[PDB]
């Protein structure tokens, strides 16, 4: 069902840009380990940071698992999933630490969390 | 066991990926380094022409860099890469500099050592040999300003009379596949040339005060030339070594894969034979 | 189709080999860059959406446009828009070219198509 | 036990990711080395002789030390020696740390464990 | 019987160090095939030379095999086996060729076998 004729053009375009940037980061983690990260170009350096935020932004705290970790649990609607990844991919939200995107639900919750961590 | 072959295949495939990644980045670095070394040729030629024609054309014979002096203390400059995986590039120059000093005097109080590259130092430290000057983590695209300090200091140690003679040990980019260790002396000046022509210069400054600036600039430029050739030979050595390593990894993956296929295919036809015998036994 | 397919196969062979080594942006020389851009542009011409068959006469004119270098200055992202626009331009006011290909099954005189195509390129990219 | 198990789990997972290409180490970035060094040391703590069960409070006390980096500074070969010496020190003087962990089973008293540990690492 | 409760501390420690150095050498024959031996670290370089000496010092000419080995035949006591492997593991014999450890019963023999070759 991942076709423009069954789901929105914005849904199809974001999901494509996500799979692409993740694959590009996978093609570079050998070079990032053997050679200094200071050897990567400006474009690739930003591509790595965005892939790093997106990789954890896919994480979500579940209600049935609240007892294990103590995290309340979240439900995210389709409009906010698309809007969240689009805002990261479009490079609007860059001056926010990677730790803020781990276990948060919607992207506004990640933005307040950055501040909760005093950053 | 099939599991030993399969785990060995996954490991060798990871090494093949690792070697190919380093070969292509080194290929990209070589294409630039070869052009960079060639781009400085007109500057290296122009500086050698002005310093030689100014010094040789009645520039005096008693000047400290041009005059003959008895030799007791000798300086050595060694060039090595800040990272390995370049085959015999580092082992050749480190072995030849060690064996050449060992053939005259091994004692650490007679000579003076200078090293460029972490691998070169690590070797001398494990060899129990001291060093006077050191420089590491240089960029793969070196600019004169990156080595201007060690270049000015090494020539300065000779100008101050602390060294009687100074030598350089480094590899040269003779061809895209074969490179060899070269030995040359930086000071004193011995590579004389004929007074064929003379360039324009100011009449007021004394010859000694001129030589004390222009001749060190030539030596510093020559250090940069040797470094440019070292970068070209390093990138070519890492590229050719990682090409051979990638080729070795592929024949090992091919041979292992045929053994994995034979071990698995041999086991499958036996299971089919047990089904036949088992069903016929009822 | 034979008069243009031979060029397509030779150009893609060259691209498919060097494309791997030339993965970086512009380190290769002009002699290989020309092959790379041609291969990329021909690869765009090979792309086609679902349930949308293209008739043989239109296939001949678009493949003829790529294999003779008329797309060599068009940006890679505009090749698909150029293909839809050029085919509608030829069908809406130059049906003589398409009817000749349909009945002769061979290209005799291509001169009309070269002149009619230059007129599209200068007026609507 | 859970609290200290967690940090051990992340350290080992990261070390397993890095060891696939740990073949070269003089070329690896210093940051990668931090991951390699920590992982080698956590592996050593897990090594144990046959018929030598360690009591849960002591397993907690040692995993806590490795995970918080207190065994990181000790040399890889010397870690096994340091483990026994530290456990004999904690039981022989100020045994209150081992007594509290048996009763409450929840830690939350680490300021003393840290300060009491610094007195051992000062000379042994 | 290979337990610290049934054999001496010196025997247990020497056997442990032998099995470990041979396993480390087995884990490197791929890396030595893909990359040049000049690319291995000093520690791995020594581990290869010691494992090479050990694998052939484990060889011995038997009395019942004089027709096949062309050598007299030897009997080695436990004390000289433990002393022998400990002396190689501790690096006292690094300046001795690998070929001197092949087909000799005891360590003193390996040293005169090195003398029989300038």
Short mmCIF file of C-alpha atoms in Angstrom, two decimals, chain A residues 26 29-31 34-36 38-39, chain B residues 17-18 21-22 25 29 83 137 140:
data_model
loop_
_atom_site.label_atom_id
_atom_site.label_comp_id
_atom_site.label_asym_id
_atom_site.label_seq_id
_atom_site.Cartn_x
_atom_site.Cartn_y
_atom_site.Cartn_z
CA UNK A 26 24.75 2.96 6.49
CA UNK A 29 29.71 4.10 9.14
CA UNK A 30 32.85 2.14 8.02
CA UNK A 31 34.64 5.40 7.00
CA UNK A 34 38.47 3.83 10.53
CA UNK A 35 39.10 7.50 9.54
CA UNK A 36 38.44 10.58 11.70
CA UNK A 38 36.79 15.35 10.66
CA UNK A 39 37.45 13.79 7.18
CA UNK B 17 33.95 -3.89 2.58
CA UNK B 18 36.47 -2.21 4.93
CA UNK B 21 36.04 1.82 1.46
CA UNK B 22 39.65 2.83 2.33
CA UNK B 25 38.95 7.47 -0.33
CA UNK B 29 43.18 11.70 -2.13
CA UNK B 83 47.93 5.93 10.03
CA UNK B 137 47.99 14.37 12.78
CA UNK B 140 45.95 14.68 4.06
#
